[PDB]
């Protein structure tokens, strides 16, 4: 290229050093100690006893060669509360007579159609621990008498069985392990203000005995502790269970996993962020605390919190730190979690219904924010070091402006420009023979550096010509040789890319598999057994 001479037409300087901000090397975090609470989805489970008399009434046609069961009528009948506390508890015996009401009439059944007697409750043969039963007879009385007549006999079997009882929210009923549903709150009482609970029976059905000592029917050992014993007579049994107040045995919030080294991130303005590196989750709550007077039955979320915040306060941080407030901070987190947080200061320093989903959103929020905060810190340092490197390099670009001032214009602009040093500012200006054979060969064209031909001789009279080098020896041309060997001061930075990873669906158990667990399925058993009369009999035919 040919270079015209620069004039004083257009001047320009170099850009000076420039300032640039700093990365945020400090966040407003608060180390603490926290426990987490979820929705209680588990029912209220308690122990109970059932007392009934199993009455079967069998009728037999007695033939000459055989006997045939005509009727077999089984009814279960309640044992009165006076007989629970005066013969079963005192003596371990039960009368062989059942008096009960049925079709609004007082009716009576006698065992073996005989006079009543007290019979000892013996244990069942199949009695295992937790599923213990007691019964008076092992026989079912049947009268098989003379030929040609019907004969009816009556068995009365007094059964005492230890059952488990379950109650689900709002605790207006409970169900026994026999399958029986009791339409009454298990927290009902006629005393100490427990009468506002739901009773679905007559007042004569219910009865409560204060200062009761349970007597075990195998060991005949009265218990050391007393209890208030509720009694309820049903048309089919009497259930007996221990009374406890509702607010002491039931919460709507259940304890989930604890967090030893919880950090309360307040870097994002307007919200809190509870990060546990041991759980692997970050929970985002608001600033205002939860009012635990608004949640129904949420009263153990603060006494079980402080009993376990303090229980590991005396295990990890006692010599190095102290708590603050003596009442933990209770927050409603995103997704339905209750974060009972307690700060940890240094030694040198209309009800609400809470429904809890899954915690998969908090694992992603932990994983994203921990990889966000590192790549913003890392790339805020390479930005701060690139800004500083270009400032100290500007001293080197100014020193090659006093000597060879035309190289700094070619590098800064891009086109092969020519600059002259006009004091402290630069002015920019934007038939080929081989050579004359007789320092630099700048004589005539038909020759400085970087293929720039001068319009004069300026030397004392290799050289690079185009894409070649012309060799001279004692000021005489030889050949246009090439050089393959090249030195390079360029540092290399080979940065690859993240390859794409596809995430196919992957579940350990599917929905059909997780519902096919259990011996019996009630919807499949019923849609086979209610087809029984249509499958093995003829309903649509009518005799005449």
């Amino acid at each position: 290229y040919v270079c015209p001479p620069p004039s004083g037409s257009t001047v320009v300087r170099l850009e000076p050093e420039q300032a640039c901000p700093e990365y945020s090397q400090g966040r407003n975090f608060t180390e603490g100690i926290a426990v987490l609470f979820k929705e209680n989805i588990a029912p209220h489970k308690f122990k109970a006893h059932i007392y009934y008399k199993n009455v079967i009434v069998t009728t037999v046609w007695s033939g000459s060669t055989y006997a045939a069961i005509t009727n077999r009528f089984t009814d279960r009948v309640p044992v009165p509360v006076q007989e629970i506390t005066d013969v079963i508890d005192r003596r371990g015996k039960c009368v062989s007579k059942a008096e009960y009401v049925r079709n609004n009439h007082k009716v009576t059944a006698f065992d073996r159609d005989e006079n009543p007697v007290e019979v000892d409750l013996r244990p069942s043969r199949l009695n295992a621990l937790g599923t213990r039963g007691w019964h008076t007879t092992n026989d079912t009385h049947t009268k098989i008498g003379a030929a040609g007549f019907y004969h009816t006999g009556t068995s009365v079997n007094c059964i005492v069985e230890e059952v488990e009882a379950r109650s689900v929210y709002p605790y207006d009923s409970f169900a026994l392990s026999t399958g029986d549903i009791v339409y009454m709150s298990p927290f009902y009482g006629l005393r100490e203000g427990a009468h506002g609970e739901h009773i679905g029976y007559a007042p004569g059905r219910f009865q409560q005995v204060e200062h009761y000592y349970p007597i075990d029917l195998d060991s005949r050992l009265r218990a050391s502790e007393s209890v208030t014993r509720n009694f309820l007579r049903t048309p089919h049994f009497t259930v007996a269970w221990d009374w406890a107040p509702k607010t002491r045995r039931v919460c709507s919030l259940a304890k989930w996993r604890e967090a030893e080294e919880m950090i309360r991130d307040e870097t994002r303005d307007g919200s809190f962020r509870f990060t546990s590196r041991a759980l692997g989750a970050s929970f985002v709550s608001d600033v205002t605390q939860l009012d635990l007077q608004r949640v129904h039955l949420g009263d153990c979320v603060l006494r079980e919190a402080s009993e376990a915040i303090d229980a590991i306060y005396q295990r990890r941080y006692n010599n190095t730190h102290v708590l603050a407030g003596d009442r933990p901070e209770v927050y409603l987190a995103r997704g339905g979690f209750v974060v009972a947080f307690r700060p940890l200061i240094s030694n040198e320093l209309g009800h609400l219904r809470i429904t809890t989903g899954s915690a998969e959103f908090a694992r992603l929020q932990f994983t994203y924010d921990h990889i966000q905060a590192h790549v913003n810190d890392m790339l805020g340092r390479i930005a701060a070091a690139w800004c500083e490197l270009q400032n100290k390099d500007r001293t080197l670009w100014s020193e090659m402006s006093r000597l060879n001032p035309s190289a700094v214009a070619t590098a800064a602009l891009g086109q092969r420009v020519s600059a002259r040093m006009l004091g402290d500012v630069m002015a920019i200006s934007r038939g080929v023979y081989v050579q004359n054979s007789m320092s630099r060969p700048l004589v005539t064209f038909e020759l400085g550096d970087d293929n720039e031909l001068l319009i004069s001789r300026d030397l004392i009279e290799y050289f690079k010509l185009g894409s070649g080098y012309v060799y001279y020896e004692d000021y005489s041309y030889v050949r246009m040789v090439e050089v393959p060997e090249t030195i390079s001061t360029r540092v290399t930075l080979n940065l690859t890319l993240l390859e794409d990873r596809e995430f196919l669906p992957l579940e350990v158990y599917t929905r059909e598999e997780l519902a096919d667990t259990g011996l019996l399925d009630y919807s499949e058993i019923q849609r086979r057994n209610q087809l029984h009369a249509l499958k093995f009999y003829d309903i649509d035919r009518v005799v005449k």
């Epitope: 006629l190 005393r191 009468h195 007042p203 004569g204 219910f206 009865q207 409560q208 005995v209 200062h211």
Partner: antibody, heavy 122, light 107 residues
């Protein structure tokens, strides 16, 4: 019929001790609790406490924890109330009442005594 | 203790007038139990379980109420019904009787 025969009027000097009886007839004595009430002259009824004459459990009032003790013999079918450390504010008619050994809807003082006039004077 | 404040202390009714009396409880109790006492006699059970009448009491006595408000009303008052009437609870320790309503038949 159910009858709760109770003791007689007793003039007793201050600082002494009085045992007041209540004899039952007409029911099985050992499966009903026996309660005691107090009625000063011209005023209302105050509950002392009870005794269960099968488990010998006594539950009493906190105003009468140091002024009354309750005992029952199983033979003579009687209940007793021992009033001690007497004051002139302990002059009343003291009744004896029958109550069930459970708490149902029909648990009430179904049969009463006839009263013992107690007088603390000189 | 549960205070059982009986509003009409003395009540003067005329034989034939429907007269009510109310017992006000401090906290909520399960049931209320009414007792009648005359001068120089033991108390007598009169209404149990807030609405059930005892043995040998005329049907003109009827009681109603729930929670902290209870009431005893007489349909047609007679001269044999002049006595004092006590409401009573056992829902808490100690058992507490009310104040008393002296009914005076204004003849």
């Amino acid at each position: 019929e159910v009858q709760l025969q109770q003791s007689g009027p007793e003039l007793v000097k201050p600082g002494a001790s009085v045992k007041i009886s209540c004899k039952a007839s007409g029911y099985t004595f050992a499966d009903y609790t026996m309660h005691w009430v107090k009625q000063s002259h011209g005023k209302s009824l105050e509950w002392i406490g009870y005794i269960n004459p099968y488990s010998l459990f006594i539950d009493s009032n906190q105003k009468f924890k140091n002024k009354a003790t309750l005992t029952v013999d199983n033979s003579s079918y009687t209940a007793y109330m021992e009033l001690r450390s007497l004051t002139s504010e302990d002059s009343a008619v003291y009744y004896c009442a029958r109550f069930p050994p459970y708490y149902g809807f029909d648990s009430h003082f179904d049969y009463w005594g006839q009263g013992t006039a107690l007088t603390v004077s000189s | 203790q549960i205070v059982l404040s009986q509003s009409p202390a003395i009540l003067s009714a005329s034989p034939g007038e429907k007269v009510t009396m109310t017992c006000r409880a401090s906290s909520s109790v399960s049931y209320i139990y009414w007792y009648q006492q005359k001068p120089e006699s033991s108390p007598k059970p009169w209404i149990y379980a807030t609405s059930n009448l005892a043995s040998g009491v005329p049907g003109r006595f009827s009681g109603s109420g729930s929670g902290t408000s209870y009431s005893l009303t007489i349909s047609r008052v007679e001269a044999e019904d002049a006595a004092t009437y006590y409401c009573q609870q056992w829902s808490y320790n100690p058992y507490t009787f009310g104040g008393g309503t002296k009914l005076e038949i204004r003849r």
